[PDB]
Amino acid sequence: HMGSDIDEFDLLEGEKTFKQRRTFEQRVEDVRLIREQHPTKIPVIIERYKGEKQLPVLDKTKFLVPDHVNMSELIKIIRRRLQLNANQAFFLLVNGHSMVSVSTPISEVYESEKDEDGFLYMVYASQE
């Protein structure tokens, strides 16, 4: 009888992101200030994926990255700061996906992937 006897229930259970801490206009003004005073740097927000239990949390989520730095170098930096073991899986996701081009400047990435507010958002995880 195709599991007709089985019913579903939503199980409930019992620290804010940058977008939660700052309004859109506040973020746009931050980016304006960065563009004015640090024209060769890319504003980048890096946060831990919601629900990630393997990787620790970083002490800083807001970064200025020199234009020439590529994703491989950024991954190395973040892994070092998280103090990960060499065999630990790690992914740095931009708009939910891994970047294919890991040798190109982050400014080039920025032009494709930036948020409407002008920040570039990344999330790190031990999967995806």
Numbering used by the authors: -16 to -3, 4 to 117
Task: Give the exact sentences the study uses for this entry.
To prove whether LIR2 interacts with the LIR-binding site in LC3, we solved two structures of an LIR2-LC3 fusion in two crystallization conditions. Both structures are identical and solved in the same space group. There are two molecules (molecule A and B) of the LIR2-LC3 fusion in one asymmetric unit with LIR2 of each molecule interacting with its symmetry-related LC3 molecule. The hydrophobic interaction of LIR2 with LC3 is conserved and adopts the classical LIR-LC3-binding mode. The first aromatic residue, F29, of LIR2 interacts with the first hydrophobic pocket (HP1) consisting of I23, P32, L53, F108 and the alkyl sidechain of K51 and the second aromatic residue L32 interacts with the second hydrophobic pocket (HP2) consisting of F52, V54, P55, V58, L63 and I66. The salt bridge interactions of residues LIR2E28 with LC3K51 and LIR2D30 with LC3R70 are observed in both structures. F52A mutation led to the reduction of LIR2 binding by about sixfold (Kd = 3.14 µM), while R70A mutation reduced binding affinity about 15-fold (Kd = 8.10 µM). No binding of the free LIR2 peptide with the LIR2-LC3 fusion protein was observed under these conditions, suggesting that the LIR2 peptide competes with the conjugated LIR2 peptide for binding to the LIR-binding site of LC3. Therefore, RavZ recognizes LC3 mainly via its N-terminal LIR2 motif by binding to the LIR-binding site in LC3.
L. pneumophila inhibits autophagy by injecting an effector protein called RavZ into the cytoplasm. RavZ functions as a cysteine protease and irreversibly deconjugates mammalian Atg8s from PE to inhibit autophagosome formation. Unlike Atg4 that cleaves the amide bond between terminal glycine and PE, RavZ cleaves the amide bond before glycine. As a consequence, the RavZ-cleaved Atg8 proteins cannot be relipidated, leading to inhibition of autophagy.
